[PDB]
């Protein structure tokens, strides 16, 4: 039992509707207006082939930038300096207003929602996860504080070998609908989370996507809103975005908070703009000045033992669902597999969005190239 | 074997990607930009409770109209007289720009695409289905002409008892992803179609959703385009619609042509406007004047033996995926279960869109009420 969860619609029974009941009353009134949430669906374009390159100014400083973007399988690239879009690139076949999967950049958005609730006093990061999700008692999340989830400083037995279907990484995906269910798999994401275990130690960084989903679960218990709605109410609806964002949902309607959000490059930049504006967005304050300051300040360096990160960023750290480089520019970034970045360059008051599709989720090679681009573009924005 | 089908993306292998391979190259470049086509997804609103009733003029003639709409579980209602929206209604919780499942009104859209191709000389309705889809040899579609599919005049052993999972109606849904697959079910919609059989007789009307999917299959074989794209290229992209429409897709990416399209009420009205404009839309001619004329003229009355239709419309018929009332007003309508109608009233040059969610897919009761409303509103538009 995973306890109470936000109903898919007002008055809906637990877990309703399912793929086999959405056509029945009372579910159908809701389902007929949100079928994409139940069945895979394609867009039928209202509009009746070549890459779009508008690298503007930085072009002179970075002559081979377009080629570098192509080399890193770039789908969408956008640089926002202050409130102005100063550079843009979209591969052939990807429109400027098309949406792109964010993978783990989604985590930084979730952390933002949590931050909003902390500001409201609805969530106390010092409290144990079980204070908000009692059903996580008996799991690896029994004992750790919400802040430890936010900073991913919980030791968890989590097999990351996606080649092995028995791995936690693969099981997590199947439990959420990202892959075909296998006999024995948990019914939904909530159930999957309760199956996680660890030695009980905390304090050391361990990147684990399950942590973000636990944060989303906490968000639901504290607000009573489906994570999908909370993500809109506390963040998306305040950005004055061009388009809605989307998020994959599991069989209960629970959004895949750790990596299932998709949005346009320009809209993602609005999240970065909000961060560089002390937590304020066009529709109102999203998070407190303090929350933003803590994100830019970074997490405990000693907790960060991931060489994949520290080899490039020796003084790097992680906090509140954001990667902190700890470099001379104080760069902080949301990061997602296959080349997704919501990169903040406070020095130039700029945001760099890079959405890609590397053939591999992660390799030292791709990261070296990707970071080289983000750093070069950041430096190209410096006053000279 | 169901033969060649349009690749999900340029160069894609047959059936790729699947729910278990979309994250892999080369599929991921496409998948990351169209994840909703693979995994159920929810919209994260960019916008931060009460019914909207703007029945304008017809209000005076139909004082209790709003109540009548509520009684028939109306979600969206819109009347377009000429090029002007003269009446609108949206239930509480449904925004004017929200999309709604069209159910079988989707069939009329498919027939329109077929008509466009007939006008181009790419499809000859007199030709046997097997001329375009040879793989349907050995099935109930081996022998009948494309026109017989268009007019649904093929006898098919098709169990319509949805309560029975073994029924063709239920199996059709599961094969397309509208329901959870059961061991033994066809892998996709194409395969399901090839399993259909009949006594070989033709000429009498038999409403069967499988017919529309065969039409979509023909569309794909003749154009080489995924039905999703053909629906946009030959119809949607020429309407100057406010929003994209959406269509559910099965595991191969094949759109559920018979009933999976969703769109706004106002945009659906643009389809009716095109029909009343002799087949021309803002973006160009969609179908020929002759095609539209044949739709308004109706099909063979003798073929129409469905009492559920003739008890209300004695001189009714069906042709090219449209229901023809044969009444004194010459009303013709796209119809879908649970109360969906794309109703044409040529006399007043008006289109009536009614999207609903009746608790039941079909009952004499709901239809009596629904038709009473459509007829009363049509008459209220008459010059006096
Ligand atoms: N859990 C499935 C993949 C989620 C994305 C993870 C990441 O981008 O680091
Ligand atoms: N084949 C699943 C239902 C399709 C809708 C049918 C109809 O509206 O008549």
Cα B303 to middle of ligand 2, angstroms:
21
Q: Are residues A261 and A119 in the same domain?
A: yes
CA angle B324, B328, B332 (to 5 degrees): 20
- CATH of residue A277: 3.40.710.10
Last residue of a domain, one of B224, B257, B274: B224
Q: Are residues B247 and B378 in the same domain?
A: yes
Contact between residue B257 and residue B107 where contact means Cβ atoms under 8 Å apart: yes
Q: Are residues A85 and A216 in the same domain?
A: no
Asked how this structure was determined, the answer is X-ray
Q: What are B70's two structure tokens?
A: 């509520």
Q: Are residues A134 and A216 in the same domain?
A: yes
Asked if residue A202 belongs to a domain, the reply is yes
Atom 4 in ligand 1: residue holding the nearest Cα: A259
Entry resolution in angstroms? 1.6
As a three-state string, the secondary structure of A134-196 is: HHHCCCCCCCCEHHHHHCCCECCCCCCCCCCCCCHHHHHHHHHCCCCCCCCCCCCHHHHHHCC
Per-position b or e across B258-293, b if 16+ CB within 10 A of its CB: bbbbbbbbbbbbbbbbbbbbebbbebeebbbeebbe
Q: Are residues B182 and B315 in the same domain?
A: no
What distance in Å separates the CA atoms of residue B234 and residue B232, rounded to the nearest whole number?
Answer: 6
Instruction: Kindly give the residue spans of alpha helices, DSSP state H, lying in chain B.
Output: 27-31, 58-61, 65-71, 105-119, 146-150, 168-176, 189-194, 209-223, 227-234, 265-276, 289-297, 307-310, 364-380
What distance in Å separates the CA atoms of residue A185 and residue A172, rounded to the nearest whole number?
Answer: 9
> What is the phi/psi pair of residue A47, to 5°?
-100, 135
- CATH of residue B131: 1.20.58.710
Atom 3 in ligand 2: residue holding the nearest Cα: B259
Residues of A in contact with B48 (CB under 8 A): 233, 237-238, 283
The parent domain of residue A203 ranges over 125-224
Query: Considering only residues 47 to 86 of chain A, which have any Cβ-Cβ distance to chain B shorter than 8 Å?
Result: 47-48, 73, 75
Asked if residue B79 belongs to a domain, the reply is yes
Specify the 3-state DSSP secondary structure of B366: helix
Cα B108 to middle of ligand 2, angstroms:
12
- Among all bound ligands, the one having the nearest atom to the CA of A173 is 1
Angle, helices B105-119 vs B209-223, to 10°: value is: 30
Q: In whole angstroms, how large is the CA radius of gyration of chain A?
A: 20
Q: Are residues B170 and B247 in the same domain?
A: no
Tell me the CA distances in angstroms from A137 to A140, A196, A325, B119, one per residue in order: 8, 11, 34, 67
The set of protein residues with a Cβ atom below 6 angstroms from ligand 2 is B 103-104, 172-173, 209, 258-259, 336-337
Q: Which residues contact A8 (CB under 8 A, 6 or more apart)?
A: A16, A17, A27, A30, A37, A226, A252, A253
Cβ of A258 closer than 6 Å to ligand 1, yes or no, is yes
Q: In whole angstroms, how large is the CA radius of gyration of chain B?
A: 20
Put simply, the answer to whether B46 touches A239 (Cβ < 8 Å) is: yes
Last residue of a domain, one of B181, B208, B224: B224
Asked if residue A376 belongs to a domain, the reply is yes
Contact between residue A107 and residue A115 where contact means Cβ atoms under 8 Å apart: no
Nearest to A33 among B35, B94, B233 (CB): B94
Put simply, the answer to whether A36 touches B41 (Cβ < 8 Å) is: yes
Q: What are B142's two structure tokens?
A: 């081996």
Residue recorded with tokens 């469905």? B306
Q: What are B227's two structure tokens?
A: 């039905």
E-strand stretches of chain A: 41-44, 52-54, 74-81, 84-90, 100-101, 245-248, 261-263, 280-281, 284-285, 317-319, 322-324, 332-336, 340-345, 350-356
Last residue of a domain, one of A207, A224, A241: A224
Q: Are residues B194 and B277 in the same domain?
A: no
Q: What are B194's two structure tokens?
A: 């090839």
Q: Are residues B263 and B322 in the same domain?
A: yes
Instruction: Kindly give the residue spans of alpha helices, DSSP state H, lying in B15-89.
Output: 27-31, 58-61, 65-71
What distance in Å separates the CA atoms of residue A352 and residue A125, rounded to the nearest whole number?
Answer: 29
Q: Are residues A213 and A257 in the same domain?
A: no
> What is the phi/psi pair of residue B335, to 5°?
-135, 145
Put simply, the answer to whether B228 touches A180 (Cβ < 8 Å) is: no
Q: Are residues B230 and B208 in the same domain?
A: no
Q: What are A21's two structure tokens?
A: 């009941």
Cα B311 to middle of ligand 1, angstroms:
58
Put simply, the answer to whether A246 touches B36 (Cβ < 8 Å) is: yes
Asked if residue A5 belongs to a domain, the reply is no
- Is the sign of the CA dihedral A190, A195, A198, A200 positive or negative? positive
Query: Considering only residues 146 to 205 of chain B, which have any Cβ-Cβ distance to chain A shorter than 8 Å?
Result: 177-180
- The answer, for B336 touching chain A at a CB cutoff of 8 Å, is no
Q: Are residues A254 and A213 in the same domain?
A: no
Asked if residue A24 belongs to a domain, the reply is no
Q: Are residues A182 and A205 in the same domain?
A: yes
Cβ of A185 closer than 6 Å to ligand 1, yes or no, is no
Domain total in chain B? 2
- The answer, for B283 touching chain A at a CB cutoff of 8 Å, is yes
Specify the 3-state DSSP secondary structure of B133: coil
Asked if residue A6 belongs to a domain, the reply is no
Asked if residue B60 belongs to a domain, the reply is yes
Put simply, the answer to whether A46 touches B241 (Cβ < 8 Å) is: yes
Per-position b or e across A140-162, b if 16+ CB within 10 A of its CB: bbbbbbbbbbbbbbbbbebeeee
Contact between residue B155 and residue B198 where contact means Cβ atoms under 8 Å apart: yes
- The answer, for A330 touching chain B at a CB cutoff of 8 Å, is no
Q: How far is B47 from chain A (nearest CA, A)?
A: 5
In eight-state DSSP terms, residue B142 is S
């Amino acid at each position: 039992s995973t306890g109470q969860h936000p109903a898919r619609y007002p008055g809906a029974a637990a877990g309703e509707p399912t793929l086999d009941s959405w056509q029945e009353p009372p579910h159908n009134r809701w389902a007929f207006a949100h079928l994409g949430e139940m069945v895979p669906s394609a867009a039928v374009s209202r509009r009746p082939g070549h890459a779009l390159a508008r690298l503007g100014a930085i072009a002179a400083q970075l002559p081979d930038l377009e080629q570098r973007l192509e080399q890193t399988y770039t789908d969408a690239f956008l640089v926002l300096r202050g409130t102005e879009v100063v550079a843009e690139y979209y591969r052939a076949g990807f429109a400027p207003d098309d949406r792109h999967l964010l993978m783990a950049v989604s985590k930084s958005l979730c952390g933002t929602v949590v931050g909003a609730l902390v500001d409201e006093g609805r969530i106390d990061p010092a409290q144990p996860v079980t204070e908000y999700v009692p059903e996580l008692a008996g799991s690896v999340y029994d004992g750790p504080s919400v802040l430890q989830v936010l900073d991913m400083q919980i030791s968890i037995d989590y097999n990351e070998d996606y080649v092995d279907p028995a791995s936690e990484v693969q099981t997590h995906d199947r439990s959420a609908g990202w892959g075909t269910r296998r006999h024995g798999d948990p019914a939904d994401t909530y159930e999957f989370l309760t199956t996680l275990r660890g030695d009980g130690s905390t304090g050391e960084f361990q990147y684990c996507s399950a942590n973000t989903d636990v944060l989303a679960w906490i968000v639901e218990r504290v607000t009573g809103l489906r994570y999908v709605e909370a993500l809109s109410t506390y963040l998306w609806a305040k950005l004055d975005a061009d388009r809605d964002a989307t998020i994959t949902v599991d069989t209960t309607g629970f959004g895949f908070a750790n990596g299932g959000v998709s949005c346009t490059a320009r809209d993602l930049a609005r999240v970065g703009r909000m961060m560089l504006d002390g937590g304020v967005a066009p529709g109102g304050r999203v998070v407190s000045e303090d929350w933003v300051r803590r994100v830019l300040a970074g997490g405990s360096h000693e907790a960060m033992t991931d060489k994949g990160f520290t080899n490039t960023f020796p003084d790097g750290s992680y906090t509140r669902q954001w990667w902190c480089t700890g470099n001379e520019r104080g760069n902080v970034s949301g990061i997602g597999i296959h080349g997704q970045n919501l990169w903040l360059d406070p020095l130039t008051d700029s945001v760099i969005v890079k959405l890609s599709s590397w053939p591999d989720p992660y390799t030292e090679h791709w990261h070296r190239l990707q970071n080289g681009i983000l750093l070069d573009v950041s430096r190209a924005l410096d006053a000279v």
